[PDB]
């Protein structure tokens, strides 16, 4: 764990600020939020296989079957409100299409 870059001791600059002996960022219980969740993913996969697809997912999968993937992204963005969520949903549907073929 690299020690942080020391400050320069002046009020302006790239590493401006009073000079102290900086300590590294200590581990936190919240650090486990970025770790992959294998059991949660397995439970979600079982539930998804059990229940099937939602109407949004069916519409996006048909959009992806034909060449229109930008329109699938637009539809996802309209339904979800966020571009990151739309891209995640489109990627999940692409992976589901690949899994269905294979």
């Amino acid at each position: 764990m690299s020690a942080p870059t020391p400050r320069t001791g002046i009020i302006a600059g790239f590493n401006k600020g009073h000079v102290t002996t900086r300590r590294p960022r200590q581990p936190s219980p919240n650090d486990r939020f970025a770790v992959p969740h294998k059991h949660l993913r397995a439970v979600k996969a079982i539930i998804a296989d059990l229940v099937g697809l939602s109407p949004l997912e069916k519409r996006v999968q048909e959009f992806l079957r034909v060449g229109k993937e930008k329109r699938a992204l637009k539809y996802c963005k309209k339904r979800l409100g966020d571009f990151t969520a739309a891209k995640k949903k489109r990627s999940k549907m692409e992976e589901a299409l690949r899994h269905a073929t294979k």
Binding site: R7, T8, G9, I10, I11, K16, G17, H18
Partner: protein, 144 residues
């Protein structure tokens, strides 16, 4: 005190300095700053120019702690030095050290003649202040 007010001198006057013709009515010109663009425009325009309109950008959520930057000049630097240290201070020798951020200042400006040479620790400085204090036998040390 009520005994010093004009109400006591006007006992028996029946008008209290407001006249028989005009009288003292409730609100004869509106309430507050009413009519600053009509029927009080002369007053507003000759006594408070610039009142109406818009100017400049908008700084949403202005925190004034980040902008804190008091200034001190070169001829005022003896306020931050004890008398005995200024007694011994001289060019080419041991000089008192002034910490501006601990004394309450951020920038050294440099107007006038510096009375006592010293080493000034300052966050900011002017070019004229830096040059003048270096000529006078002192110095500036940047701090944060």
């Amino acid at each position: 005190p009520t005994r010093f007010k004009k109400c006591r001198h006007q006992r028996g006057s029946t008008f209290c300095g407001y006249g028989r013709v005009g009288k003292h009515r409730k609100h004869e010109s509106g309430r507050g700053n009413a009519g600053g663009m009509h029927h009080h425009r002369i007053n507003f325009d000759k006594y408070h120019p610039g009142y109406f309109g818009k100017l400049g950008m908008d700084h949403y959520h202005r925190k004034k702690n980040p902008m804190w930057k008091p200034t001190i000049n070169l001829n005022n630097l003896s306020r931050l030095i004890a008398a005995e240290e200024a007694a011994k201070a001289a060019k080419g020798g041991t000089l008192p050290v002034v910490d501006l951020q601990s004394s309450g200042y951020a920038k050294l400006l440099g107007n006038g003649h510096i009375q006592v040479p010293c080493i000034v620790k300052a966050r900011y400085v002017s070019k004229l202040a830096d040059k003048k204090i270096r000529k006078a036998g002192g110095a500036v040390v940047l701090q944060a």
